[PDB]
Symmetry: D2
């Protein structure tokens, strides 16, 4: 039976910082030397971080640590009633930008590597764009795994498109500015698989039972997906309105966040973009659309299989395949037509790229954090253990 | 501002029967003569019946009444805490089969015409199959508007299909019988547009605001769609499990309902099947799949436009078009390739077909119901006014 | 029985110019006054021009003439053995650019309006971009009906995408420059409906017979589609290679044509872009992609129905509908979500826009052409009568 | 450089029978013992048989021979001017039924195993249905690799569906019986990849060059695909009309072939059905539709990848994966939802199934054929060497 901290999320480490929003974990080195620049991972806040450190055999964290990188990770607070009014901006400032600042401080480096996964990627991208408009450039590189930046054709609009009346007269839309997200208060249950689907006792019961008895969806995934998290009402409103519905984050300067316009092209650092071919949560062609929005040197890699199966594919198992193509045409079909299929995991491709941005190796740290930020408790930390 | 009984659902009539489950409405004639056989309409219980009698200009009820048919309609109870354990079977027996029995009794006819809309169609079809296995045949004809019988490719499965591990060994599924629907208790909020989507304060707020300001979705539709209904937990479990997930109602004899196996081919009466081309709630090709399951003489008609716009298209407005094809090949694309597009509403095509199954005209009734079932209160009735 | 010049392509006019490549037609006015700026129409060279002047009731030419515009039209030569080496560039220089020069000369105007249909649109766009790199700006406005500029996802690539080997090693593509189009010589039969499909005696026989007996595809369309044209081998090679396969015309400066790089954004004039919703030859979302490539004020309109049915929809018949939306988001689904459906033909919307770019009305000309270019023979001309 | 009989199609064997239509090859055993029942392979006549014996490393023939089965194979004649009037029936009687009779005669067995690939599968299925209506049952089992029986949604219809006029009146289709296939005479070039696409000098030149320089489509595939075959005009007409266009072979009794109605359910033998997931020539869901038409015990297996890459995946290379599911629901998506992904080639799954239908092992034959049918020349034979 799965248990966080006993047989799931067991990579050794410590919490080195915490605030209302999150706990920053730092993992124990597993090598004698490590790269100068550490990697900060920003996982999604829809479901918990541990999908990235699921079990020892399948852990991305462990794998990266074993390649000689110092890893820091944002373990999100499962929000309580005091955070029922927390906003998208609050998370960007007090968690994403904060985590970057703390990791950079502990590392002693001018620049760190950053990774985002799913909504984590959208969060980290936004945070870095906010930072760039402030004239700050704390990232050497960005890795976006299964991240949506351009939300075109995610399908939430579809059932409404053919409901308009046939007009015999000049007609105009309503055109109003929406009721502000700040007028809501609440905690709404969320999970990854059913994020755009019902979340109610009956649906959760019927679906969970059907999957277990009629499909080979793995138990570890069902465990993680079932360990729900609460989303603050204004946060959830903002995300739904400005990405899925209005698709504005990809329009340079359209949105204002934490006092500045968000222009994704302003992040401007080497960026590794990943998608999974059979992913219906983040269509691979939607992840690919990030290539049209970001500056600097980009690499796109496509992994075989599903949303979780494609991303969590450790090389030791020698399973699946991935595709690479150095050229980045506008159209994903054109990208694929030119791509070469390679056996196995895409992890080695990424860690090779990451090594290139991480500087020279030096002796590994013996302790966690620094004088300012000392160890608080062992990873995985108590925040990840909180029920929604 | 919309108000049920003041400017919506105003076709004149009376409640002639009521029980815990529903109120049966009977409409006042608008012609001197009417067909011998009346039509009973079974609307969906997801949202309220009035989408079928929306406003005088757009009312299907009014239109049918004006063609000389006596119309009875099932106005569903918005379930309360006493009905938090009501089942799919309870609804079939105590509402659908009951409504048929009461309408037949009042009419004095051996057979009546029946119409189902959306989930109403699935309900009425099930009820009639149950009746046929009991050796009872109360319907002269069936009309299925925007009804799913075969739920293949409705897409709820999609995000889970590519999550299985790659096996190097013989492997088998879990294969268990599911936890019974009867173990749940509850009332879950439901609406048509978001039935397979979230239903929560934030989603409802964000979506409603976005539609109003950025799309031409009509206000009358948004009113109806926003007037939610509660679904009993076991009912909701059954529907989700046996149709959308396991797609078993279309497998003859697979499901047992109200003590008998359900075989759709056992309904065996002339049947008019309708779908709307741009409908993403009930794909037209899914409605078309009913043609492969039902016996007797079938007609399929395809209306232009969306889920509501295509079905609620009164002929007076002279808008849109529909397609007809007497041949019924297995494949819907083959059906369409041979179909002729006709100007305007499909309503006249249907009412012409309906006239053919409804017998000879005779003088209209002066009063509602009969000695056994007298008028209780005026339509639209108090049940439809209850908030969820 | 259809016959070009007897009951098809009968709008009154004259050939005022001819060369190896085409005949320029000028139509007789049907109004006392006409706009200062005439419209030159460049139809496709795949099949013949007359789809635009099909029959009096269905003629776009006649309709535009009746709104008070002087219309000139390019009637393409059905190439003979002497033209088996004609190139894409030859057509741009000797036909498209030539037609513009002759129409401008006859009109006496500094600028003319231009329309392209299907491949005609791709041709005229290219010609105008070539002209703009030469510093010439002969067009006041451009109308692109059912035109592909960005050829992404037209599907010719699809059957080849999943044929690569799985590599266990670093691998690279072949990467070679293609064998030049100029090495081919030939005349290849072409038609619109089967342009990406077989064109052989058996296919043409089987398809034509099946359509006539099992579908409502109209006889006038089948006549036009069956009246094939020959494509010079190098022309056909260029078109297939640089648009459908490599999709390079949309990459600013990528292609060199008639000595200059082609940059579509350099046309820079008000542009009206049209697509038909159920068009599978030119997907409406592909026509919509033109909005991302062109400068100046753009309007996009979407007509209901098929490739020919949607475009050839004269207002007198009062059939179908079209959609308008002044906003031009990047994604076509977002455009549609905000669009208002309007009854009937889109023609009046376009001719209203066209009136705005065509200047003041003045008395209609009494004669064809001018001293330099006098009438040669009556429209439709002998070129359009030549068999392939 | 590829050459048939030198480094392609080199599995050792002999031609043991020939007629105007084909040469029957028999392969030399590579084991001391072989199953009692041999396997006859019927490859497509669109392109040549050798895709099934491509190179020693990638040969399906060699692999099956190495598992202990006697293999016979139909090597089709590349038709000449004398065969420009050959019909679908001629091929069924004089090649498919003939090959079965000759293989059965040489083997001395009451029943043989049969395999069809692509159009070969459609041919062999038809032949066996013809045989069953004659009361003959020469097959112990059937293997259908990448075979279309139900041709629904292959897309040839699509561009014509939305061209009908809007009718304000009762309207009817043309409804005529088609001009007979027997009125055509000719030899039409065909290849697998472009079977539903142009086949002309320019297309073949442009596509071949583009694939070589911009994609990883393998050279061996391009060689095979480029080695075209001629199709007799009536044969081609029949195939196109009755499968792709009218989809009649799947309607029991609809078509008459070689004097008898064709009912696929009459074949009635254990059948192994295979499809490739990313195949756009034979969609895997179209191959899956065979499960609804055939009697007896069926197995469906889905291989990963493309049309050729998925089927030609030898186990030694240890690449890709395949899916299995013993249950056969009507819907392919439901089949997939329950399927288990297995590492590597599907070949071992099939040869294990085939062993089960092939009887007891006995000593391998020392010679080819029998007294009636002796060796004529060495495999691959001269027929396969003929240019179109």
């Amino acid at each position: 039976a799965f248990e966080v901290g006993r047989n799931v999320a067991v990579t050794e480490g410590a919490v080195v910082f915490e605030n209302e929003y999150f706990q920053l974990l730092q993992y124990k080195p597993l090598t004698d030397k490590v790269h100068a620049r550490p990697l900060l991972m920003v996982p999604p806040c829809i479901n918990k971080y541990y999908i990235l450190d699921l079990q020892p055999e399948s852990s991305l964290v462990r794998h990266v640590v074993e390649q000689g990188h110092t890893v820091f990770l944002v373990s999100w607070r499962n929000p309580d009633a005091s955070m029922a009014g927390s906003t998208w901006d609050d998370y960007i400032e007090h968690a994403a930008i904060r985590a970057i600042e703390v990791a950079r401080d502990i590392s002693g480096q001018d620049k760190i590597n950053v990774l985002g996964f799913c909504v984590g990627g959208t969060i980290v991208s936004t945070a870095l764009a906010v930072l760039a408009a402030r004239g700050e450039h704390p990232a050497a590189s960005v890795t976006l795994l299964t991240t949506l930046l351009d939300f075109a054709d995610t399908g939430i609009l579809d059932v409404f498109v053919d409901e308009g009346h046939v007009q015999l007269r000049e007609a105009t839309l309503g055109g109003g500015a929406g009721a502000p997200c700040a007028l809501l208060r609440g905690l709404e249950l969320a999970n990854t698989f059913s994020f755009l689907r019902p979340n109610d006792l009956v649906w959760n019961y019927v679906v969970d039972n059907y999957l277990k008895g009629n499909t080979p969806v793995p138990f570890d995934l069902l465990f993680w997906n079932g360990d729900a998290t609460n989303l603050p009402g204004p946060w959830y409103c903002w995300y739904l309105r400005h990405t899925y519905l209005q698709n504005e984050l990809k329009v340079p300067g359209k949105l204002t966040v934490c006092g500045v316009p968000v222009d994704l092209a302003s992040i401007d650092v080497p960026t590794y973009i990943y998608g999974s071919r059979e992913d219906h949560i983040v269509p691979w062609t939607a992840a690919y659309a990030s290539t049209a929005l970001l500056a600097n040197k980009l690499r796109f890699v496509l992994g075989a299989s599903g949303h979780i199966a494609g991303v969590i594919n450790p090389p030791a198992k020698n399973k699946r395949s991935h595709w690479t193509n150095d050229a980045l045409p506008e159209s994903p079909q054109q990208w694929l037509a030119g791509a070469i299929e390679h056996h196995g995991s895409w992890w080695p491709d990424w860690t090779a790229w990451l090594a290139g941005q991480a500087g020279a190796k030096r002796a590994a740290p013996a302790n966690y954090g620094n004088a300012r930020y000392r160890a608080i408790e062992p990873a995985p930390g108590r925040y990840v253990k909180a029920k929604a």
